[PDB]
Coordinates of C-alpha atoms and ligand atoms in Angstrom, one line a residue:
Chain A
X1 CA 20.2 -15.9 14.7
X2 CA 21.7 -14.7 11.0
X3 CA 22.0 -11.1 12.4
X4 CA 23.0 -9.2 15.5
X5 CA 20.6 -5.9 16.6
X6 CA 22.4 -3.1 18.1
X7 CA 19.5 -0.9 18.8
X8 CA 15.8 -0.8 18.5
X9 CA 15.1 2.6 16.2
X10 CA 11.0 2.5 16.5
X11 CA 8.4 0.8 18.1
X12 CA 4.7 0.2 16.0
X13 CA 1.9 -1.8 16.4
X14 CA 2.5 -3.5 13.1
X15 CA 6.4 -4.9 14.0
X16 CA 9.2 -3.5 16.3
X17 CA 12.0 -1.9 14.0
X18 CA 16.1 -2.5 15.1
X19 CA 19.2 -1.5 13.7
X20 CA 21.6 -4.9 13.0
X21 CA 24.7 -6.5 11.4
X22 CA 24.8 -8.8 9.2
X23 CA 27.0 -11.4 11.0
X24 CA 28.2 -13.1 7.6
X25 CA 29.1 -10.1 6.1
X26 CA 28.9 -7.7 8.6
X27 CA 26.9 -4.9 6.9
X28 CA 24.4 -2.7 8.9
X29 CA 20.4 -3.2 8.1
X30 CA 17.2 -2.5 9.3
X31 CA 15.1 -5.2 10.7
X32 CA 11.1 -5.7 11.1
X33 CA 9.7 -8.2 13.4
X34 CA 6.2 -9.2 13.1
X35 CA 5.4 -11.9 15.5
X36 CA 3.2 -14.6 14.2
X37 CA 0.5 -15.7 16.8
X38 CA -1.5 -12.4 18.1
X39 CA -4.8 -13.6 20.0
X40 CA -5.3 -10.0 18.8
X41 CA -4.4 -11.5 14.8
X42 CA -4.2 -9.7 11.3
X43 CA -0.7 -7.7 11.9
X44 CA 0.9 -10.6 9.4
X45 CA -1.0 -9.7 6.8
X46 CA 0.3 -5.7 6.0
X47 CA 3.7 -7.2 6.2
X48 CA 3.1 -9.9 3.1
X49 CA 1.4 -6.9 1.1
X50 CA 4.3 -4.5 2.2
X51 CA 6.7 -8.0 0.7
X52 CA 4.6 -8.1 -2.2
X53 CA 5.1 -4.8 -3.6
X54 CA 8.6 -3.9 -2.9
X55 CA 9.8 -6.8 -4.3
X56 CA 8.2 -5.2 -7.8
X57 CA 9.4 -1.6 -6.9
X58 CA 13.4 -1.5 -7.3
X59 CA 14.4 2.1 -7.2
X60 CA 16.8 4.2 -5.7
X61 CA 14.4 6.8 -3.5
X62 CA 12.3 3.2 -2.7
X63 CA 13.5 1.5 0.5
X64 CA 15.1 -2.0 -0.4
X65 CA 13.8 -4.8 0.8
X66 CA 17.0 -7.1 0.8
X67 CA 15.3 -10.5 2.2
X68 CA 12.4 -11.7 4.2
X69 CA 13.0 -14.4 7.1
X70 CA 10.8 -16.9 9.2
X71 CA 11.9 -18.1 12.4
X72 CA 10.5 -19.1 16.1
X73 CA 6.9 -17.8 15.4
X74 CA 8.6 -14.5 13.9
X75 CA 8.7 -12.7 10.3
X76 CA 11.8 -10.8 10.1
X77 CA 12.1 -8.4 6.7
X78 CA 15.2 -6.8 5.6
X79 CA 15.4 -3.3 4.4
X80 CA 18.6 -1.1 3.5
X81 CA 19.5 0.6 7.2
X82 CA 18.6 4.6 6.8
X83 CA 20.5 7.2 9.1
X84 CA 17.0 8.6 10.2
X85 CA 13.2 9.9 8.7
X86 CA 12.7 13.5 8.2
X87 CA 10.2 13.7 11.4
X88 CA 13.5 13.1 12.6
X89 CA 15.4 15.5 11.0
X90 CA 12.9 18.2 11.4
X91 CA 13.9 17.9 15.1
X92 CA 17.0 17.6 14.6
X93 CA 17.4 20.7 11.7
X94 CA 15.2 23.3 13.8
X95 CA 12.5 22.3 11.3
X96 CA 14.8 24.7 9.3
X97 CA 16.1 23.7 5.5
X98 CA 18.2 25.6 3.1
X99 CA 16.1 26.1 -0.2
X100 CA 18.6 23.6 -2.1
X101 CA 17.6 20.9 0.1
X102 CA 14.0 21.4 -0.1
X103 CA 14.3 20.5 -3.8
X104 CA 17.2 17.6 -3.7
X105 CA 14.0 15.6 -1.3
X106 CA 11.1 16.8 -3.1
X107 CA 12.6 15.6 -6.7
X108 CA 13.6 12.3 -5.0
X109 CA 10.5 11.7 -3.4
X110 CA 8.6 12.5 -7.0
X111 CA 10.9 10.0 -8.8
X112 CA 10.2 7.2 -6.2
X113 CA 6.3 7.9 -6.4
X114 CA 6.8 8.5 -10.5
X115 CA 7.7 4.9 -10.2
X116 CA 5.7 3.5 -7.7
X117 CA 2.4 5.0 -10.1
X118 CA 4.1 3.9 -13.4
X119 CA 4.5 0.2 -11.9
X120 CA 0.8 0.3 -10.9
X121 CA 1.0 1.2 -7.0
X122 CA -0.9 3.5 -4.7
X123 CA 1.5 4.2 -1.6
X124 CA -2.1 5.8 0.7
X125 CA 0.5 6.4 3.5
X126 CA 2.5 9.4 2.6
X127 CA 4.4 11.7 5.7
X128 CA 7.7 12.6 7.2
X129 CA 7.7 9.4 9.3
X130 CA 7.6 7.1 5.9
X131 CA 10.4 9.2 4.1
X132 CA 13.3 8.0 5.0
X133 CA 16.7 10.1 4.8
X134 CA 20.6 9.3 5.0
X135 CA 23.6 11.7 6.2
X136 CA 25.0 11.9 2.1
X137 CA 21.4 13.5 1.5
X138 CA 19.4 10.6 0.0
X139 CA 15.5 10.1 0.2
X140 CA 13.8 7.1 0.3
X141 CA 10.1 6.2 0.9
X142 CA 9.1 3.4 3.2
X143 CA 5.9 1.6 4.8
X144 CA 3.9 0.0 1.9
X145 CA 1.9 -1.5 4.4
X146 CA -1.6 0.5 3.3
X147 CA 0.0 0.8 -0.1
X148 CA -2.4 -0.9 -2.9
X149 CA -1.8 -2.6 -6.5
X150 CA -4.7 -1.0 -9.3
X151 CA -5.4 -2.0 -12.7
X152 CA -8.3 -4.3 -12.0
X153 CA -11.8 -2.7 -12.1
X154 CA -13.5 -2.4 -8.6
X155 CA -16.5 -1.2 -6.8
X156 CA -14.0 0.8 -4.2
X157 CA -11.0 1.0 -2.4
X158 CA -10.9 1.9 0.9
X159 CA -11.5 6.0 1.9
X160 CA -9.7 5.5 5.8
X161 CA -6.2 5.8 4.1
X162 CA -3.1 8.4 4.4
X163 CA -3.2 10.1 8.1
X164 CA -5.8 12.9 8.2
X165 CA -3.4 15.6 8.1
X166 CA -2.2 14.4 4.0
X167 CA -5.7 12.8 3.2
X168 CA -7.2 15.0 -0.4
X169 CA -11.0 17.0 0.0
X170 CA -11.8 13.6 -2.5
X171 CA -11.1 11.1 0.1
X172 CA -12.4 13.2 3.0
X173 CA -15.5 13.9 1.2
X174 CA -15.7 9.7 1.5
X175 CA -14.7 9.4 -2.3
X176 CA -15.2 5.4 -3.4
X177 CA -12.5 5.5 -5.9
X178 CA -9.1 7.4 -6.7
X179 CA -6.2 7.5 -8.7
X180 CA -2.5 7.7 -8.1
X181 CA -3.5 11.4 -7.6
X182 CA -4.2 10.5 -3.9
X183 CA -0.9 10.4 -3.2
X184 CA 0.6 13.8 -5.5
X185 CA -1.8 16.0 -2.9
X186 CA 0.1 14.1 0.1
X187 CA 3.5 15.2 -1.8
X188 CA 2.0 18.8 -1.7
X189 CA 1.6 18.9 1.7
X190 CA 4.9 17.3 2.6
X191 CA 6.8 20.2 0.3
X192 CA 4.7 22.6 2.4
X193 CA 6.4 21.5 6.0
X194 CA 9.8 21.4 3.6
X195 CA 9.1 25.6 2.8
X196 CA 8.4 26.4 6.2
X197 CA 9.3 24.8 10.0
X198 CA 8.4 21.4 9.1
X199 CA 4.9 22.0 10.3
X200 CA 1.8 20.4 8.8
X201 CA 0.2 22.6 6.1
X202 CA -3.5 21.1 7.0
X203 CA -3.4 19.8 10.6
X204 CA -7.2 19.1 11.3
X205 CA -8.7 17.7 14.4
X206 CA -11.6 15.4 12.4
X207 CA -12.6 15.2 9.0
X208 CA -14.7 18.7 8.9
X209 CA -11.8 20.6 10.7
X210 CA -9.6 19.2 8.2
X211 CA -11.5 20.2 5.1
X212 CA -12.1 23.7 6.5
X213 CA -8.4 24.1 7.1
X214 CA -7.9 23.0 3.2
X215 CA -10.4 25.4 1.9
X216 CA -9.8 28.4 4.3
X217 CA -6.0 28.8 2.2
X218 CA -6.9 27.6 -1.2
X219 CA -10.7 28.2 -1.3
X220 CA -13.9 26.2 -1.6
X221 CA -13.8 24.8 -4.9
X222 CA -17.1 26.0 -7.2
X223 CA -19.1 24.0 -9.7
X224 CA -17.0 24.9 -12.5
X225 CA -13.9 24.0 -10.8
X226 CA -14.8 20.7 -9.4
X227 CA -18.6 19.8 -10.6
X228 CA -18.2 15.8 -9.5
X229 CA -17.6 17.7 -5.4
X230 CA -21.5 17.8 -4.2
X231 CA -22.5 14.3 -5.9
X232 CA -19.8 12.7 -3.9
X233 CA -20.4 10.0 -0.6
X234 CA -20.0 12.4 2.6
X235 CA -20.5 15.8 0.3
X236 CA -22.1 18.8 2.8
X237 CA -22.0 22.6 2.1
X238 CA -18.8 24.4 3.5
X239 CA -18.1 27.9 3.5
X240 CA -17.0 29.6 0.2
X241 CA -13.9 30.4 1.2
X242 CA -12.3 33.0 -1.2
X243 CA -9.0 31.8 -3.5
X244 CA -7.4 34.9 -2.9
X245 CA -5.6 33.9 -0.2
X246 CA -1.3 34.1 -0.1
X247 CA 0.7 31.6 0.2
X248 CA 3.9 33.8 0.5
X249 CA 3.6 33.7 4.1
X250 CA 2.7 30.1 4.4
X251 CA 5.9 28.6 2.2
X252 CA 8.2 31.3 2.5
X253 CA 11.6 29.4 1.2
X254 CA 9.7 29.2 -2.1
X255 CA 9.8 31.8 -4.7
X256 CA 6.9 32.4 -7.6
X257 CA 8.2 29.2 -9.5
X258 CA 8.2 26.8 -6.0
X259 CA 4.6 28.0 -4.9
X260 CA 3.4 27.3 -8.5
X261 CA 4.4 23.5 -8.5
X262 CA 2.7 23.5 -5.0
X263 CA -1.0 24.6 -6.0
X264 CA -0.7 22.1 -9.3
X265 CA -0.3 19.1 -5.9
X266 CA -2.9 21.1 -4.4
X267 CA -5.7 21.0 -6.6
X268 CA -8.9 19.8 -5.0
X269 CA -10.6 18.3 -7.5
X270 CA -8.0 15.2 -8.0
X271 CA -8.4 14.7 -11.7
X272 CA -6.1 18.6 -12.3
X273 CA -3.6 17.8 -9.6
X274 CA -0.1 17.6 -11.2
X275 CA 1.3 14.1 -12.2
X276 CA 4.9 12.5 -10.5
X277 CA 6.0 12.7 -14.3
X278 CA 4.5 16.2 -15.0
X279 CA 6.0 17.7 -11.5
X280 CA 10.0 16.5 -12.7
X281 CA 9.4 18.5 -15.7
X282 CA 8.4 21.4 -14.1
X283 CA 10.4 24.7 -13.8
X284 CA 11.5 24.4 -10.4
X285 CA 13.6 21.4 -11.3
X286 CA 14.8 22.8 -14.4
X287 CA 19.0 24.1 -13.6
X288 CA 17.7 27.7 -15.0
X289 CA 16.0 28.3 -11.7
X290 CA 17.1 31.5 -9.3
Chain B
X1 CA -20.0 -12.2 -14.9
X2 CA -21.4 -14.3 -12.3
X3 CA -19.5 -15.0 -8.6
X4 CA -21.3 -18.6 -8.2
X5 CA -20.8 -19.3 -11.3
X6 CA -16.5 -18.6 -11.5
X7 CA -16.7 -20.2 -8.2
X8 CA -17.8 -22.8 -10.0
X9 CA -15.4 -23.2 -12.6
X10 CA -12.4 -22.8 -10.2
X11 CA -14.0 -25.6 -8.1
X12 CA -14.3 -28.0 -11.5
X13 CA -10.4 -26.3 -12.3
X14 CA -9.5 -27.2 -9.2
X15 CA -11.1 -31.6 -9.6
X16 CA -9.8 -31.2 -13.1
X17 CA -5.7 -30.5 -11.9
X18 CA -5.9 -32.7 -8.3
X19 CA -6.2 -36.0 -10.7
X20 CA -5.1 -38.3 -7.1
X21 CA -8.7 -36.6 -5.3
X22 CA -11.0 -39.5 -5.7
X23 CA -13.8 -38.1 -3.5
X24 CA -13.2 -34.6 -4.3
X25 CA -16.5 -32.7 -5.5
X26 CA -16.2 -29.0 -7.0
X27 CA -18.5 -28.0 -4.5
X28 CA -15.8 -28.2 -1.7
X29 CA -13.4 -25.5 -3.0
X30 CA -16.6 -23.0 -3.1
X31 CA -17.8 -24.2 0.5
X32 CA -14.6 -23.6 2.1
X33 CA -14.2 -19.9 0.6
X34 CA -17.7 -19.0 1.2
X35 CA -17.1 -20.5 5.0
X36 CA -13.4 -17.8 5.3
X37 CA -15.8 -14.8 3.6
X38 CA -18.9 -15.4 6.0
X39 CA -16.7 -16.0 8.8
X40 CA -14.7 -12.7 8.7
X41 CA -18.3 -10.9 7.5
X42 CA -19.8 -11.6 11.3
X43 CA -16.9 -11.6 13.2
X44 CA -16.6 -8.0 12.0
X45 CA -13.6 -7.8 10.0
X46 CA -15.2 -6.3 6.7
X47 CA -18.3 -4.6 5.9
X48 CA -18.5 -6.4 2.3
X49 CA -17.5 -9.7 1.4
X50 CA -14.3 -10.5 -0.7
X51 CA -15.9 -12.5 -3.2
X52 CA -16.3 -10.5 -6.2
X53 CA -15.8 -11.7 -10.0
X54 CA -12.1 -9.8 -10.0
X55 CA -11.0 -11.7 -6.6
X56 CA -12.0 -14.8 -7.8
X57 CA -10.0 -14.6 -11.1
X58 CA -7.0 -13.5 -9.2
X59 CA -7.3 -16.4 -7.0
X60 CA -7.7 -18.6 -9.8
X61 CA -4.7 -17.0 -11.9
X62 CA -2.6 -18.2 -7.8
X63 CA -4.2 -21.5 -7.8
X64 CA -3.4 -22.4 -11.2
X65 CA 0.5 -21.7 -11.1
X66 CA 0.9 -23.1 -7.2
X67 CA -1.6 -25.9 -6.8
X68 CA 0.7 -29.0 -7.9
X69 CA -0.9 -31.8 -9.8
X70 CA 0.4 -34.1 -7.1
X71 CA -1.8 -33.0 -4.4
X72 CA -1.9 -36.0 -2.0
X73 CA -5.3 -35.6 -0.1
X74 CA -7.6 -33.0 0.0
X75 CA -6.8 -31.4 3.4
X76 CA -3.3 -30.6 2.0
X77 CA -5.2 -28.9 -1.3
X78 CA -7.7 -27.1 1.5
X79 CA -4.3 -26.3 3.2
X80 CA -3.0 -24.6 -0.4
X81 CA -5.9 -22.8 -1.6
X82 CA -6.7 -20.9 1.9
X83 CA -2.6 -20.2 1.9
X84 CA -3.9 -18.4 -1.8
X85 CA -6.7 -16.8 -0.9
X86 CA -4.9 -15.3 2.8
X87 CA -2.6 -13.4 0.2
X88 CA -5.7 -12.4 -2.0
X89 CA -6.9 -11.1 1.2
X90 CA -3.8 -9.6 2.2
X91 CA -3.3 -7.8 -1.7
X92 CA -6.6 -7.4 -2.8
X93 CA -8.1 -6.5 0.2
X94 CA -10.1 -3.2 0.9
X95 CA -9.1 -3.7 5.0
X96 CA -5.5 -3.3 6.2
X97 CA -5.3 -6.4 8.3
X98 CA -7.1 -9.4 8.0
X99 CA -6.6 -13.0 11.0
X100 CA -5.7 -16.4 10.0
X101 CA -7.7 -18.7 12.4
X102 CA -10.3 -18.8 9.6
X103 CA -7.5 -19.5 6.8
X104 CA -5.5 -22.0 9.1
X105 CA -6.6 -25.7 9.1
X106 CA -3.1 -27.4 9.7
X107 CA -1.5 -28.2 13.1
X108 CA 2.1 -26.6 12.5
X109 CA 1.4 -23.2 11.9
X110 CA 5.4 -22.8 10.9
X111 CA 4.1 -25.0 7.6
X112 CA 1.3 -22.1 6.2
X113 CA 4.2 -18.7 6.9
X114 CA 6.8 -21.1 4.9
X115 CA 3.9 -21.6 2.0
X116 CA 2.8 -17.7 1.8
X117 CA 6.7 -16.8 1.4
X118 CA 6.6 -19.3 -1.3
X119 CA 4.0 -18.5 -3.2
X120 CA 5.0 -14.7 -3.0
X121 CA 8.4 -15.2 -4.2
X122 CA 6.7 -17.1 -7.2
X123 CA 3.8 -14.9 -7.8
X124 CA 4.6 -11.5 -6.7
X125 CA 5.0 -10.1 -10.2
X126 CA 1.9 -12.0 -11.9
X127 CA -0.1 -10.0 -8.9
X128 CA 0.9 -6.8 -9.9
X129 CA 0.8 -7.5 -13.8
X130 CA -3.1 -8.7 -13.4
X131 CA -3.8 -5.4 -12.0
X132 CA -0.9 -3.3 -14.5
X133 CA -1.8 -5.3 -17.7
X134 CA -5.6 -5.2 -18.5
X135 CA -4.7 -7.6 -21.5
X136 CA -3.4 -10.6 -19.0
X137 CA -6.6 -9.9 -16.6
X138 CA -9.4 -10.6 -19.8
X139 CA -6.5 -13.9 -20.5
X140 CA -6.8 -15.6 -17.3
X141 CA -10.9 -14.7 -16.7
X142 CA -11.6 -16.4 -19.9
X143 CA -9.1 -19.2 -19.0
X144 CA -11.2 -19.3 -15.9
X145 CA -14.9 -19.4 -17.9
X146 CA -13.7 -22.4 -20.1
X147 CA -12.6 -24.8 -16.7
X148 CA -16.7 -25.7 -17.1
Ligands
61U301 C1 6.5 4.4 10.2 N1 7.2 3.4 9.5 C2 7.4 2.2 10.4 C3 8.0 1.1 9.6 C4 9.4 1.5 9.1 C5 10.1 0.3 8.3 C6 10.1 -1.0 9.0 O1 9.4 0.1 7.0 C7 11.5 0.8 8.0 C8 12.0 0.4 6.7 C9 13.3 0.8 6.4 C10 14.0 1.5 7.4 C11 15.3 2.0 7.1 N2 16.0 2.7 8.0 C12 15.5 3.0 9.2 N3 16.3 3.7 10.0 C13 16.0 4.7 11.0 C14 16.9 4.9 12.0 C15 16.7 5.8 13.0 N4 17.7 5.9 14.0 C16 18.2 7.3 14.1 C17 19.7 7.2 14.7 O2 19.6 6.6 15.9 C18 19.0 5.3 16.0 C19 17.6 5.3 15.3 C20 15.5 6.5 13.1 C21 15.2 7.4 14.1 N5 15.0 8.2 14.9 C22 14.6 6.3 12.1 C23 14.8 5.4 11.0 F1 13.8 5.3 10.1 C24 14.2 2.6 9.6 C25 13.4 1.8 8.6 N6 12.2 1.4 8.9 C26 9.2 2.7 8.2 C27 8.5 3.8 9.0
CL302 CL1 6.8 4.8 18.7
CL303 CL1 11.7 -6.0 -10.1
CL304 CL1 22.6 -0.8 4.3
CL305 CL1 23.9 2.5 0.1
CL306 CL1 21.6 13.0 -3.4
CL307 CL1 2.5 4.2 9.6
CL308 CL1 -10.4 1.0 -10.5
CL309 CL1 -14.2 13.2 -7.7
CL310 CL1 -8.5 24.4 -5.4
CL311 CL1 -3.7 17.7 -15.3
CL312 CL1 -17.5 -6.1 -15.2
CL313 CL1 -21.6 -19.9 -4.7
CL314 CL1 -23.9 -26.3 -14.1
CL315 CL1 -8.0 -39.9 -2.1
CL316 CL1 -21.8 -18.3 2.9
CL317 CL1 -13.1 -3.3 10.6
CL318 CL1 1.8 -30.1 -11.6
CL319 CL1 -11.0 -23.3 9.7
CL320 CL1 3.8 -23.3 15.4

């Protein structure tokens, strides 16, 4: 009507996705649809959250949304056009990245989140799939649609958020309420699949497989380490799993410095995981770094 | 701290600003949210109900910038205040993905989309600022406690 799609680039149960030109002035976009009269209803209303929130979070590693239209029973939003994600570009890369790169997207994707959290915003949706790379090396994260403002006191938020393979031990364990923290244990699992063949660190079947799979590599937390674990919702006895188990073998692009950073996003108990702020400061982004 | 009783006060907020309602009662406002919340409660789209204290004075912080003195009849303002509380839903809400049978009450569905990209486009950054500044949230829930 206003723009011209060239191709449809993905296909979800919340919109379908297509790469268009703006007709005006002839510039390349990405477009959502989200049709407006679903027997089946409630699709709408991610897409006004997902508006909501990105029009508060203007950033250069946060997707831009450039304009939202309504037409012929259909929501339309705008976004910057990306030249893939990294699902993508795993793929595409032999799920193989030189060391320099695995830093360039895991400092990009901290400064997005650092702003996201500093702005008041839970993204609850963290993967490949939602980061969102260009050809000149840029990364961007997308799909605010389970994202969440915070600030206001509440009884809970909501414990089915972030796929199961990125979800903390907190949330699994049925936690009512976390922090931005939810979403720096996500970031460690995503700089995991960066060190190695893109693979997911934790790839669980259920719930229990996935907490096993957490614990088996960095151990069953004790009560000294995390005293808050066996009072929580869905708490059950697992295993004590020992902590001396390597990660050498598990990110092996990352040197002592790299696997470091990684156990401070990997902390079980969310309150000692590593901040978005804290983790730019670290070592491994320092330019004294091997 | 009581949900009745801020429903209350938005309802008498909401007969105080809509000067034109003549047969407007503060009971109406509380009725027709109450109806959306039980509605979506057993049609099994929530385990909980919306409702709370918080929810309430974030619809009321909406209300108060969008509702227009000059509301003409009190379908129009029924019209208005379900268009707020759909995107209280959508923002506040604990599930992804909430319907809008319940919230619709106007023929021309194309009128309510137009009204939520509206009230978005003038709200968006007082929704994230109730939640970011604690200061602005204890502002607009006594604001709300003195509409009685
Ligand atoms: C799961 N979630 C779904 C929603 C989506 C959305 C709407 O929020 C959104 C936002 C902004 C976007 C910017 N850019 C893109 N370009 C892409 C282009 C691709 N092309 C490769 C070359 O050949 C044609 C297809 C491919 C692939 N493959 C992936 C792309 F992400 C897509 C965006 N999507 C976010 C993700
Ligand atoms: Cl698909
Ligand atoms: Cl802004
Ligand atoms: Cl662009
Ligand atoms: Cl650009
Ligand atoms: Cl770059
Ligand atoms: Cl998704
Ligand atoms: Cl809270
Ligand atoms: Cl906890
Ligand atoms: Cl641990
Ligand atoms: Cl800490
Ligand atoms: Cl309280
Ligand atoms: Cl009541
Ligand atoms: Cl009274
Ligand atoms: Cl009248
Ligand atoms: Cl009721
Ligand atoms: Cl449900
Ligand atoms: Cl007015
Ligand atoms: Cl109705
Ligand atoms: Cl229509």
């Amino acid at each position: 009507q206003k723009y011209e799609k060239l191709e449809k680039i993905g296909e979800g149960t919340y919109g379908t996705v297509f790469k268009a030109k703006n007709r005006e002035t002839h510039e390349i976009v990405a477009l959502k649809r989200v049709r407006l009269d679903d027997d089946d209803e409630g699709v709408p209303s991610s897409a006004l959250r997902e508006i909501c929130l990105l029009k508060e979070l203007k950033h250069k590693n946060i997707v831009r949304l450039h304009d939202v239209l309504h037409s012929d029973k259909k929501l339309t939003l705008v976004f910057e056009f990306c030249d893939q994600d990294l699902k993508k570009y795993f793929d595409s890369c032999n799920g193989d990245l030189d060391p320099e790169i695995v830093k360039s997207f895991l400092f990009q994707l901290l400064k997005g989140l650092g702003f996201c959290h500093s702005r008041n915003v839970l993204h609850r949706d963290l993967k490949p799939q939602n980061l969102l790379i260009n050809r000149n090396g840029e990364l961007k994260l997308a799909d605010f649609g389970l994202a969440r403002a915070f600030g206001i006191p509440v009884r809970c938020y909501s414990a089915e958020v972030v796929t199961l393979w990125y979800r903390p031990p907190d949330v699994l364990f049925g936690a009512k309420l976390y922090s931005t923290s939810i979403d720096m244990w996500s970031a460690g699992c995503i700089f995991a699949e960066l060190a190695n063949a893109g693979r997911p660190l934790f790839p669980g079947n259920d719930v229990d497989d996935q907490l096993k799979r957490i614990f088996r590599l960095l151990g069953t937390p004790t009560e000294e380490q995390w005293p808050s674990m066996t009072k929580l919702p869905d708490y059950k006895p697992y295993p004590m799993y020992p902590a001396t188990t390597s990660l050498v073998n598990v990110v092996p692009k990352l040197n002592a410095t790299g696997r470091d950073l990684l156990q401070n996003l990997l902390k079980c108990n969310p309150v000692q995981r590593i901040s978005a702020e804290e983790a730019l400061q670290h070592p491994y982004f320092s330019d004294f770094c091997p | 701290a009581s949900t009745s009783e801020l429903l209350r006060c938005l309802g008498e907020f909401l007969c105080r600003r809509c000067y034109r309602l003549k047969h407007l009662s503060p009971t109406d406002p509380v009725l027709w949210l109450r109806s959306v919340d039980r509605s979506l409660l057993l049609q099994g789209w929530q385990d909980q109900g919306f409702i709370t204290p918080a929810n309430v004075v974030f619809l009321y912080m909406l209300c108060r910038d969008v509702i227009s003195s000059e509301v003409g009849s009190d379908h129009e303002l029924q019209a208005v205040l379900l268009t707020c509380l759909y995107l209280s839903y959508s923002y506040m809400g604990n599930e992804i993905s909430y319907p809008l049978k319940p919230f619709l009450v106007e023929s021309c569905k194309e009128a309510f989309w137009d009204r939520c990209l509206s009230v978005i486009n003038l709200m968006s950054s007082k929704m994230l600022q109730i939640n970011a500044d604690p200061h602005y949230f204890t502002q607009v829930f006594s604001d709300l406690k003195n509409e009685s």
